[PDB]
């Protein structure tokens, strides 16, 4: 049958021209499509982490959703998904404002279910550092670079003219040890992990406003709040298709609780993945 991840938000009340009672959903939701026949509207049911809703509603077709979206600018509708079995604990990528706090809280509050991978660096090992503990210390920039071009790293960067990178093997190492690897990385690492058959749980924290940002962090100035909100907008525009979920709240506590639940809901041995 056809199972789909919703890449956008749908509100019945907002849409006119519905043939039957619609089914309104949120981004990230998984929908079971009962009949795709009409070239306009589809009949689907919501798929919950617990059950499968006994209900039916009308959702716009992929075709319909796209014409509407394309009509504006001078396209995200539905991502077909399959249920897949995993032998590993999925990595976790939180993105958006407050993500760092959310990362710190997961590791602190649940040390057994969460952890950090060992990154690679070309920075010369200090006498007190142990290779394999702090970093995997690469003794050749040439080698480090060849590793990068060969896609050994899901992310790489520079600090004080030293190369740093986050290895796939290194992430897979925590994943197989039974912990969610908490990654501080950009939206680009998401696809690489997927390509690597390690499917991260990717959660974006979407600020409702600049005020929303300022309320959760009271020590930010207007300039900072403005900047923080503006980079969250482009982050969302760039990576949206690659998010497993998007969360909003009026408080950090509210956001955090949601991420804990989503991670829980996404942490089973069977997960929904793109069909390809």
């Amino acid at each position: 049958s056809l199972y789909v991840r919703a890449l956008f938000d749908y509100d019945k009340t907002k849409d006119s021209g519905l043939p039957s009672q619609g089914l309104n959903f949120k981004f990230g939701d998984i929908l079971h499509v009962i009949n795709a026949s009409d070239d306009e509207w589809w009949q689907a049911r919501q798929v919950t982490p617990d059950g499968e809703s006994d209900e039916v509603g009308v959702i716009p077709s992929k075709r319909r959703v796209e014409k509407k979206e394309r009509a504006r600018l001078k396209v995200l509708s539905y991502e077909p998904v399959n249920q897949q079995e995993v032998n590993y604990t999925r990595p976790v990528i939180i993105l958006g404002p407050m993500k760092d706090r959310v990362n710190d809280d997961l590791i602190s509050e649940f040390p057994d279910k969460f952890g950090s991978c060992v990154p690679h660096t070309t920075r010369p090992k200090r006498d007190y550092e142990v290779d394999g503990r702090d970093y995997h210390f690469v003794t050749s920039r040439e080698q480090m670079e060849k590793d990068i071009q060969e896609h050994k790293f899901i992310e790489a960067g520079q600090y004080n003219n030293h190369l740093y990178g986050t290895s796939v093997q290194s992430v897979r190492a925590v994943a197989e040890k039974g912990k969610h690897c908490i990654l501080d990385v950009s939206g680009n690492a998401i696809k690489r992990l997927q390509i690597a058959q390690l499917y991260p749980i990717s959660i974006f924290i979407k600020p409702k406003s600049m005020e929303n940002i300022m309320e959760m962090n009271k020590r930010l100035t207007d300039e900072q709040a403005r900047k923080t909100f503006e980079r969250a907008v482009r982050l969302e525009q760039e990576f949206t298709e690659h998010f497993t979920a998007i969360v909003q709240g009026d408080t950090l506590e509210d956001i955090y609780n949601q991420v804990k639940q989503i991670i829980e809901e996404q942490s089973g041995p069977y997960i929904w993945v793109p069909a390809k």
Binding site: P119, D134, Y135, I148, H151, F153, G157, Y159, Y164, D184
Partner: peptide, 15 residues
């Protein structure tokens, strides 16, 4: 730690 990772200038990577 890890401080250096906290601040990095990221590099674009090949497809």
């Amino acid at each position: 730690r890890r401080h250096s990772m906290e601040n990095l200038e990221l590099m674009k990577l090949t497809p």
